[PDB]
Amino acid sequence: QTLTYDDIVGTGLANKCPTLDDTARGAYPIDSSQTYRIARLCLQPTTFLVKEEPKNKRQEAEFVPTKLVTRETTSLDQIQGELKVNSDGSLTFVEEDGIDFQPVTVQMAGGERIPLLFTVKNLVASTQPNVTSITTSTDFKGEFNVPSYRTANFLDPKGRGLASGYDSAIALPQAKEEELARANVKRFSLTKGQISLNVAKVDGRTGEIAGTFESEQLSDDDMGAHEPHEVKIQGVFYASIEPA
Amino acid sequence: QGMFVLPFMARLGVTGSWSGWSITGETGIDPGFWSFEGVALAHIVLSGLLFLAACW
Amino acid sequence: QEINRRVQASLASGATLEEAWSAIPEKLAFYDYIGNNPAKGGLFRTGPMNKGDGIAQAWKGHAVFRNKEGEELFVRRMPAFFESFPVILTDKNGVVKADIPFRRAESKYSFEQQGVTVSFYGGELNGQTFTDPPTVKSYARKAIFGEIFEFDTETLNSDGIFRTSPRG
Amino acid sequence: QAWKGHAVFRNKEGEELFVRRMPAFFESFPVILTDKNGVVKADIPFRRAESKYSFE
Amino acid sequence: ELVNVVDEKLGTAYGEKIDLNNTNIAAFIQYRGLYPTLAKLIVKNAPYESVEDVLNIPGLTERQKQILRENLEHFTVTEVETALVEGGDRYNNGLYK
Numbered sequence: 001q002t003l004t005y006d007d008i009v010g011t012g013l014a015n016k017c018p019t020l021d022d023t024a025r026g027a028y029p030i031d032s033s034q035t036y037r038i039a040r041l042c043l044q045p046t047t048f049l050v051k052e053e054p055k056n057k058r059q060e061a062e063f064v065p066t067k068l069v070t071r072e073t074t075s076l077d078q079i080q081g082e083l084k085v086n087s088d089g090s091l092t093f094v095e096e097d098g099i100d101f102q103p104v105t106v107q108m109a110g111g112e113r114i115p116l117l118f119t120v121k122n123l124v125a126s127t128q129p130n131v132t133s134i135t136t137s138t139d140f141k142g143e144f145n146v147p148s149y150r151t152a153n154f155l156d157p158k159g160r161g162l163a164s165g166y167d168s169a170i171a172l173p174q175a176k177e178e179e180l181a182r183a184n185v186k187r188f189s190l191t192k193g194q195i196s197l198n199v200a201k202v203d204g205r206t207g208e209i210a211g212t213f214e215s216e217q218l219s220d221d222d223m224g225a226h227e228p229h230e231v232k233i234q235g236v237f238y239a240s241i242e243p244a
Numbered sequence: 245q246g247m248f249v250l251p252f253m254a255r256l257g258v259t260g261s262w263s264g265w266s267i268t269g270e271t272g273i274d275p276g277f278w279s280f281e282g283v284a285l286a287h288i289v290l291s292g293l294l295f296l297a298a299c300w
Numbered sequence: 301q302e303i304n305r306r307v308q309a310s311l312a313s314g315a316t317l318e319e320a321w322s323a324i325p326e327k328l329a330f331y332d333y334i335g336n337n338p339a340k341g342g343l344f345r346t347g348p349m350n351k352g353d354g355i356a357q358a359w360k361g362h363a364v365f366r367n368k369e370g371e372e373l374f375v376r377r378m379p380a381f382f383e384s385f386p387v388i389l390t391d392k393n394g395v396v397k398a399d400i401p402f403r404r405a406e407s408k409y410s411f412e413q414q415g416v417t418v419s420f421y422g423g424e425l426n427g428q429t430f431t432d433p434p435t436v437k438s439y440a441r442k443a444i445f446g447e448i449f450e451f452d453t454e455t456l457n458s459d460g461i462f463r464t465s466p467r468g
Numbered sequence: 469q470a471w472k473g474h475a476v477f478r479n480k481e482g483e484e485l486f487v488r489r490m491p492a493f494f495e496s497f498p499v500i501l502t503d504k505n506g507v508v509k510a511d512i513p514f515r516r517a518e519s520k521y522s523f524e
Numbered sequence: 525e526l527v528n529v530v531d532e533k534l535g536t537a538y539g540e541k542i543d544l545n546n547t548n549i550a551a552f553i554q555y556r557g558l559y560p561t562l563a564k565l566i567v568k569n570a571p572y573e574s575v576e577d578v579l580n581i582p583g584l585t586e587r588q589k590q591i592l593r594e595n596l597e598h599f600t601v602t603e604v605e606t607a608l609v610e611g612g613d614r615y616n617n618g619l620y621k
């Protein structure tokens with residue numbers, strides 16, 4: 001039955017979420033007197049779409065396909081948190097910890113590279129009210145935090161940074177500073193993302209669920225040097241629910 | 245954009261780049277070898293082979 | 301040294317600090333600026349010195365830095381060897397009192413911590429005082445080059461990088 | 469970058485006025501607005517002193 | 525105007541004391557008795573509306589509370605700065621010797 005590290009190593013399978021049999025169409029009872037957790041949440045992105053930015057501003061921009069260039073390094077996994085049963089019988093997942101982010105670079109037609117911090121950091125996601133069992137009709141929707149793709153020590157190629165680094169363009173000792181302020185003064189972004197988790201499979205007996213997700217968030221803004229893009233990520237997920 | 249040869253490639257069916265765009269504005273098209281770059285490459289190689297033949 | 305001599309003579313004879321500095325010829329202050337040192341150029345940095353720091357327009361005046369305690373602080377000047385140099389201010393005895401840190405997490409001497417201010421005597425800025433850290437830091441960065449000048453960088457599209465003079 | 473949209477000109481009476489277009493031959497061209505029947509209704513004058521048709 | 529938020533924080537109490545809401549955890553080595561046991565509890569239970577709230581952390585022994593009272597004059601609190609607390613930076617801020 002079960003794979004070891006040596007069976008998996010270098011195959012690509014380590015970046016894949018667990019799947020459930022087509023047979024898994026059951027219902028997982030929620031006892032509202034019981035406390036629960038998600039012991040493992042896994043998100044495997046299969047598509048990154050980036051919202052093109054028109055000059056038009058007439059007609060809406062579309063989300064376009066992109067090519068992943070950072071290889072099989074994209075999934076979020078080993079994530080855990082409390083699954084609260086709320087007074088209206090809705091469930092709320094409160095992400096606590098795990099491998100809950102991955103830097104990802106995707107490339108648009110024509111070469112523009114779009115790095116992003118693909119993440120569900122601090123996810124708080126909730127189902128519909130009265131979810132007395134988790135079934136293939138359950139979904140979770142919620143919000144998460146998207147911190148700056150680089151953290152505060154990151155130094156640009158000229159040595160400039162937020163918590164470290166020069167604070168000016170030292171190669172242009174007598175340039176007028178005003179035109180360079182946006183490059184010289186690093187800023188740390190913190191914005192919100194949104195995600196939907198759509199259950200497609202439930203094993204009533206094991207507490208395991210799998211489905212598809214779609215999340216939306218901003219990409220890297222290079223510590224405030226440029227405007228971020230809007231990204232939409234789609235893929236599959238797996239979670240194991242446990243009494244706890 | 246002052247493009248003089250690009251339209252001649254486009255007139256006969258070369259509309260995509262290896263980098264993923266097309267002149268009609270599509271994304272994720274795969275043009276095969278015969279993108280604008282592959283046409284440019286084929287002509288450069290042709291040139292070299294012709295030059296060598298001239299020497300002979 | 302000559303500028304300081306003249307200012308001290310002015311003060312001794314009873315001038316105010318503003319008047320003492322206002323008596324310094326702009327021509328003299330301009331020789332006390334590293335942008336005019338011929339050992340600050342580059343072999344392929346071509347043209348007039350004006351192409352680099354810009355066409356000099358006016359002396360800003362003499363910058364005097366002070367910390368929150370009101371002690372006079374002195375910016376350490378850039379020696380000609382150095383293409384870039386840190387910003388370090390000491391008291392009259394060479395003790396370090398303020399700087400622009402690189403790593404911030406264990407900074408002790410930041411201008412924000414030490415409440416560094418700058419006041420100008422003579423030149424364009426005579427009588428003015430700036431207390432906001434970005435502006436005070438900006439002037440401290442210029443004080444490493446010696447006396448501070450206003451430049452026109454637009455007319456020649458000057459790039460900000462020092463060139464040598466005909467002496468070099 | 470973008471179409472500004474179609475400009476419709478009108479005089480103080482509300483009549484639609486049409487700007488006379490530049491023919492290719494002309495490097496420069498006067499600014500003259502006529503009603504739908506080609507009658508002149510407004511223009512940008514060169515000499516102002518006996519102007520009758522200024523936009524003002 | 526664009527502002528460097530770390531430099532700006534240095535002109536508040538964060539630049540003068542251990543900020544229970546922001547300061548990296550090695551800073552608690554400065555005073556007897558704070559590191560690693562209390563330092564960990566403090567960072568873990570942050571942010572605090574006021575310095576005294578540090579006395580309200582659950583499970584504390586009496587000796588621990590007393591150590592906290594003796595050290596309140598070395599503590600401050602300021603608003604949480606995202607640039608200082610992201611990245612797990614309060615635990616490891618990339619500075620060694």
Ligand code: CLA
Nearest residue numbers: 248249250251252253254255256258283284286287290294
């Ligand atoms: C080996 C085959 C080959 C192929 C498949 C291509 C293909 C291409 N070339 Mg390249 N090319 C080649 C060889 C080739 N070329 C050679 C040997 C040269 C050196 C002379 C070139 C030099 C060249 C240039 C300078 C250009 C191209 C361009 C192009 C593109 C448009 C072609 C076009 O519009 O032609 C148009 C051709 C005609 C209209 C042919 C006219 C034939 C006349 C009317 C015949 C008169 C005599 C005839 C005997 C009359 C009796 C006929 C009988 C049937 C009744 C296309 C990608 C263009 C481009 O996009 O470059 C990037 C371009 O500008 N090529």
Ligand code: CLA
Nearest residue numbers: 342343344345346347348349350351463464465466467468
């Ligand atoms: C003693 C020679 C001499 C000196 C000291 C100067 C000095 C100056 N000139 Mg004048 N000039 C000269 C001769 C000189 N000039 C000559 C002969 C002409 C006619 C070409 C000019 C025409 C001229 C113009 C038109 C201008 C100046 C300007 C200037 C200023 C900028 C200089 C600069 O940017 O250099 C840059 C120097 C270099 C980039 C170094 C070049 C090094 C070469 C390329 C090395 C070659 C290596 C060799 C090929 C190796 C061989 C290897 C082999 C043996 C194996 C400076 C005051 C500028 C100015 O500000 O005017 C008001 C200006 O616009 N000059």
Ligand SMILES: CC1=C(/C=C/C(C)=C/C=C/C(C)=C/C=C/C=C(C)/C=C/C=C(C)/C=C/C2=C(C)CCCC2(C)C)C(C)(C)CCC1
Nearest residue numbers: 284285286287288289290291292293294295296297298299
């Ligand atoms: C000036 C002018 C003119 C004229 C012009 C001309 C006439 C030009 C020409 C141009 C040309 C005529 C160009 C050419 C180019 C070419 C090239 C660029 C080539 C390349 C090649 C190569 C690179 C190759 C390689 C090789 C070999 C050799 C061998 C085999 C293999 C190989 C492929 C590798 C006119 C009248 C219009 C008027 C205006 C001005």
Ligand SMILES: CC1=C(/C=C/C(C)=C/C=C/C(C)=C/C=C/C=C(C)/C=C/C=C(C)/C=C/C2=C(C)CCCC2(C)C)C(C)(C)CCC1
Nearest residue numbers: 277283286287289290291292293294295296297298299300
């Ligand atoms: C088919 C085809 C095609 C086309 C093709 C072509 C058009 C081709 C051509 C080809 C060619 C065009 C070829 C050529 C070749 C050449 C050669 C092979 C040469 C050689 C040479 C030599 C060998 C020389 C030598 C020498 C020298 C170099 C020096 C001096 C001395 C001597 C003389 C010895 C295409 C792509 C459309 C696609 C489909 C298929």
Ligand SMILES: CCCCCCCS[C@@H]1O[C@H](CO)[C@@H](O)[C@H](O)[C@H]1O
Nearest residue numbers: 110111112261262263281282284285
């Ligand atoms: C004959 C080989 C020529 C080398 C071709 C270079 C790659 S192809 C090149 O890629 C760029 C970046 O994606 C695009 O922006 C550009 O439109 C495209 O022509």
Ligand SMILES: CCCCCCCS[C@@H]1O[C@H](CO)[C@@H](O)[C@H](O)[C@H]1O
Nearest residue numbers: 274275276277278279282285286289
């Ligand atoms: C010296 C360059 C040789 C590189 C050739 C790469 C071929 S790539 C290949 O090309 C075919 C013809 O267009 C297409 O039909 C096919 O879909 C494409 O994958």
Ligand SMILES: CCCCCCCS[C@@H]1O[C@H](CO)[C@@H](O)[C@H](O)[C@H]1O
Nearest residue numbers: 261262263273274275276277278285
């Ligand atoms: C002289 C060797 C250089 C030749 C490079 C061959 C490019 S081959 C080219 O690659 C594209 C992606 O870049 C694909 O869309 C396309 O199917 C393929 O034909």
Ligand SMILES: CCCCCCCS[C@@H]1O[C@H](CO)[C@@H](O)[C@H](O)[C@H]1O
Nearest residue numbers: 174175176177435438439442450451
């Ligand atoms: C942040 C700007 C406010 C403080 C003034 C900056 C120091 S002084 C400043 O230095 C520039 C070279 O960097 C010169 O081009 C300019 O003429 C001069 O006004």
Ligand SMILES: [Ca+2]
Nearest residue numbers: 136198199200
């Ligand atoms: Ca479903």
Ligand SMILES: [Ca+2]
Nearest residue numbers: 453457458459
């Ligand atoms: Ca410029």
